[model samples]
Target: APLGPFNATLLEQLKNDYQKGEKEVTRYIELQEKVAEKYIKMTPLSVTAKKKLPPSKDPRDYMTLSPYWWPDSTKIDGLPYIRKDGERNPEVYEYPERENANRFGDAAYCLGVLYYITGKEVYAKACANHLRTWFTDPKLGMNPNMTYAQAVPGMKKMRGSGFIDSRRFSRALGVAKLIEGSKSWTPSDKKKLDDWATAFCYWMENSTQGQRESHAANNHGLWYEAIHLMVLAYLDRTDRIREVAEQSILPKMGAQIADDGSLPQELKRTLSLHYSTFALEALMEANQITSQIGINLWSTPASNGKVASQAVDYLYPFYLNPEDWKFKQIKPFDQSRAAILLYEAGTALGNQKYVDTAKRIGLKYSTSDVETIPYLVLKK
Candidate 1:
């Protein structure tokens, strides 16, 4: 299929793939044009600005001023003040201290994504600015780590229950890629940041924080591994990369996904559809990184038997019967856009059923709000 209108280069690449039999060639040009138009219409030139911060030695500190992601608050002097741990105390929008480092992950990703779709050097430079400020600055930057992310409510300063903190790393991965090849970025800056990330990856594989996050036994655990492996590859930690790919990620996925590809923890949630969407995203991340790393998380030696496309198989019925299967608490929980991710999964697994199912669900449930970042990029 064609990549879409927004990315002519990507479309050309897809066309070449079709010609080379990488994909089916039926109505290839028409499909490419349609896909291109869809993306062109959806892509946003600018994302609404979120929180911005002054130079800080700590990355975890929240910027309370930005209305997009953080709470809006007033500054005492020049600096905006936020209360510590904004999650529980939503009004307390202050920069998290040095011990809290997961802070910049989201900003980095958002700016990076804006750069990717818009090809705007400013977006890339902005992301690089945050990366250097948070990860590479000699005196100001915090260590590239998630050691204290998601602290607990009362028992600990940061709680193990705050597993939600780890999800931010996924966005950091996007930032890493955005700046990886940018000509405007300096080698010294890249090396410094890369070294910090390399050490962070090492800590994740062998340190206490890494172990705690990796063994979470929940969605956080999967995210930790997925982001860790992706960062490891980016940093050229070949052995660590391979270990996560072969030993940790693939095996764990097989165990986590049932024969029907359902995740029981997600299924049991009150917001079953939301949880399922979350799980599918995790699986999609796993599948995407695995493919980039030259490993197949789905393929195994099963002697010509049917294996479930866990990501799609689990969500197909929900897509088909959204009204009946969607969570009751939130009527019309926008989940249709999950089709975009499911479509990618289908492509990876070579299953037309999954593709058709994703298209159906996407058309039914895809509101602009349903998308994490609405109206951006080619579907796959």
Candidate 2:
């Protein structure tokens, strides 16, 4: 019932291909095994498991200290935190909520896909276990809202921008769809997962943090739409998906992209190249789902002549030739992260150049859980 971001037909084809010993899918399965092996050792770790509770004093509430904010050594109590743009404070991971959320999402997705392809009970059981622990278990399950995510120690209890911390859950939605028919996941389990997602979606659509992030006018805004789109798609809410695409995502292209395909908002960041690619990835994901729903975000042109292709084309040279990048990129640039985008845009836009460029750059740089699954599932 859920048409996932990955093409369902293509996934079935890949499963068949894997059975025939196809090298591509075979390699993907090998990679999945490595990922699953790592995940098998991991228990479900949630915000409720944190030794230091959130400001709400409820372990059920999700919490994360801001990554870019640090204590002001100049002040004794550090009443307010200062921002160092693009520099992450190590303290953010100390509480483990952010790290645990990421791990749970990635592992659940990887195992879910493996179960779909292999029909292995072990993988399905593991995937369901992680999902239940994080979303369904009475004691360990996280509350639906992200009220305290990305909180700065002394400045605010929670900010509207904190919603970005839950962005990783976007990928996990696909896993939920993949395992919809698994015997390991009962109908009641599915209902509970749906209810959890429904509650979260309500918060995203109505809460102050959700409203603010939805209008953030940058990568945050796009990711907010992207995450909501995935959740709606998983919930089989086609009307909501169409509404989000038409109302939120399409407008973002015109607002975010310049005539030359550059992201004006991201280019101003300290990690301009990285943020530009990051923003494009979110756009590509939005485009992926929209295309499935009969919207052509990949080919649709903005008034100023910028389309998704131009954005990808604009960055292709930089990815191919990072030394030619004119913007500030304090961190090392990784082109592989954009490989799937280039590949998808190339195929969707009928540009062999983009496809060849993506192949040349290689998939070695892809994030295994986030980008790699789609890369393999969608490759032609």
Candidate 3:
């Protein structure tokens, strides 16, 4: 389920199919079980695992190296890193915070769904243990502010680009909101989540990095809305949720998406096709949150006559033939991202065209990985 990404009806449908032991559903359920077993063997993750300290000198503060920046070999200390836009620096692995957060996020979603579907205590217990360690544990729980995310070494200690890293928080906490009533998940767990979400919501608006990202006109800006909307939903801040939907997100659509449906900012990137698809995913993900709040994002057009749907149309042909893309992809395009986007857009907007398009490309619920489950949930 992608609340922040999962559709409730689809999750319920998957659960019903799992109970009946239908091969279609059972195959995926069994795959989920394998991943679940792996998670059960793992200890709960927290930000304190990173040995290095943030500029704040606090281990609880989330910090990660910028993926795209590398140390200058010419410099003796590698004190200053240089930018290679699409390339990831291996030094990022030295900081365990991002990887820990990602795994922690995936576990929350996976185990929470397993608990929700199977009503098994094992799933509930593991998910709750993880939640407690990550958020509520007094000595180890992460500080809600992403004060030093994606910090470029030898440069600024914080970056607005880093806010995109916290996108996992939205997913993990979104699932946290889902597993609310489980026996293993307590009132205290939920209360701590609210506290964390409240603090995060405030940080995203008021913190220096948060304020910088808030006005970003590119994909980063969209992700900021995505995180903001999901956290607000987790907090039950319905009024502010709608306020962001109607104000922040809606206004940016026209500026980012052109009349021809191409996203100019994303299109200019070295990974234009991927960024284009990625940007749409963020928009749709944000729309899902807005959708829960009674905002009809699919039906709404931005002021410049650019609707989000037009972006799908602009990119659909490129999805069919990425080789023909006029922009500089610099690498092969992952059509699966577009396929997932198509399934989601088609399902949410009730557009048969998109469903048919993704059906042509092979929607991948058949895989064992958890990443596509939300797409499968959408396909249903």
Candidate 4:
């Protein structure tokens, strides 16, 4: 039931060529340039001006804007996907929950990336403005806690489904970190944002949604806690942050990922492309957060002494293979693999192979919306 109708033959072929390292490298490079060209065309909105972008038709769905980098009107149903703590029904009751997490984070990433690459005040200001709106605006903003996300309707209270929505912004916080010290940013502004994140962390730690997500055993549970700990750590909530990362996240990651680096649960999905992207995104997030906080997500060894970095190593082969996929939907735009995993992993491991592959594969698979953020930030 998980595997839906898709073209598997091409995927098989791509996989074979990629594994053999006999694919067309130039085509991939050309794809990256094309993706970059599209990215450069975005309207460079300033901080004050970014405020003018239209609000979600439904204010309750904070994720309407970014939607995990796929901003196509054709992609999503105009409904809010609510989740309760510790649930993973991709049917999403109303809509998908985790994808929104990616979207919110992507927005922050876009702003920071654009700022860093162009040295444009408009980009920095826009990034800061969006951050302030989401983090600091009392009337039009979200609290840092996701106590109500992913709650099933008629089965839980209003707050129960809200926390599911929190995962939508995970990577955005990372973008915030990258841009926190920019010349365009002010100390007070940073403090305000940090204060907001700290407040959110407090809510996540004590709120009902936070408690439920904390006990989750699957990828959903792991990702929720990762978001909580990563943002909290960045905002200086060191003690609780570390507790979440070491005690919670790493353990779940170790259990869920197979020795060969595949997430079996994810591999069996209708949306293979998105599922693989999501799994890799979380793995990379776990790795980055752990590294930033001075711990190692991949340090633990299996009985065979194989380390977790094998996950990244495993992913590279799949990424290059392009043939190992079978998904219902395939976007024509470039993907954000460079920022999300490939480039980051490359830098951490000091290997040009990952970087070279990412460059070669380029952004051909990226959704227009997702490309906006990671493309801007990955290189910077």
The models' CA-based lDDT, in order, is 0.51, 0.78, 0.80, 0.52
Candidate 3 whole-model C-alpha lDDT, 0 to 1: 0.80
Residue-level lDDT of model 2, residues 206-285, one tens digit each, is 99888888999899998888788778887888899888877777788778988788999999988999999888878777
Give RMSD (Å) of candidate 1 vs. truth: 9.1
lDDT of model 2 at residue 326? 94
Instruction: Give the Cα error of residue 245 in candidate 4, in Å.
Output: 3.4
What TM-score would every model get versus the actual structure? 0.65, 0.92, 0.93, 0.60
lDDT, candidate 4, 321-380, per-residue tens: 545654432442135454446765665667788767666655434444643233322332
**Total residue pair clashes for candidate 1:** 16
For model 3, residues 282-336, the per-residue Cα lDDT tens digits are 8877877777766766557766666788888899888888888998888888876
Question: Which has the greatest lDDT?
Answer: 3
lDDT of 1 by residue, 1-380 (tens): 11111122333354454456653332433343333333333322111122433335243322222211232345334233233421234432443432133445545654554455445566566667666665566655655555444332222233233333444543464356555566656787778866777766676667665777677765666777767655765565557656776666655566566666676666655566766676666656665555554555555312223233654666677666677674432435465556666666667678888776666655422222212332222232
Index of the highest-TM-score prediction: 3
Each candidate structure's count of clashing pairs: 16, 0, 4, 33
Error of 2 at 248 (Å): 0.7
lDDT of 4: 0.52
